Amino acid sequence: GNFKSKLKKAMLSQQITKSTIANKMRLKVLSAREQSLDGIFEETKEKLSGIANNRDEYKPILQSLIVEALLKLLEPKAIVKALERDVDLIESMKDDIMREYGEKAQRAPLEEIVISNDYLNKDLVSGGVVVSNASDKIEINNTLEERLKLLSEEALPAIRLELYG
């Protein structure tokens, strides 16, 4: 009787190990699959800051990040919070934005872009801007990390089809 229970018991300990080997492999694989994806993602936001820090190349990109957000915004005044290096770039293209918005809306032209005295971090944001409401209720985070991360949701199956398909 009690033989049969010690006979099962050792065959149970046998399959707890077959199972733990099998789990350490999916764990090594999964965390390796992610380590690679987080080094692809890493290189892209390093490459992007180098693009952002040459101002003249960042200039049409930024124009477009704003126009995009503004059409989801749908207010005549947007408050833009920026880095201390991009406030100078926004300033030198406010008219172009309000033009460019007008041509891509049928709502009304944008009245004003507000350069605020509060700014985004530089040790927490690499570059990019937060375009916000008139009273700062809802914001379209068109920062480099946030865009890269949301983009990650949709990048992941694409990257999976070309890499393992």
Partner: protein, 49 residues
């Protein structure tokens, strides 16, 4: 039980040998398509989505 005292040695040997080759190819195939995906990611970002 001896298949379970010697099975703790085997707890890592068969776990390691099981993906010894696969972790070398995952890291290999990444370094190729790294650059190729990074251009796509950059592109999606500097395109208004």
């Amino acid at each position: 039980e001896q298949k379970n005292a010697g099975g703790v040695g085997e707890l890592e040997k068969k776990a390691e040998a099981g993906v010894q080759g696969e972790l070398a190819e995952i890291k290999k195939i990444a370094e190729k398509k790294k650059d190729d995906v990074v251009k796509i990611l950059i592109e999606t970002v500097i395109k208004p989505s």
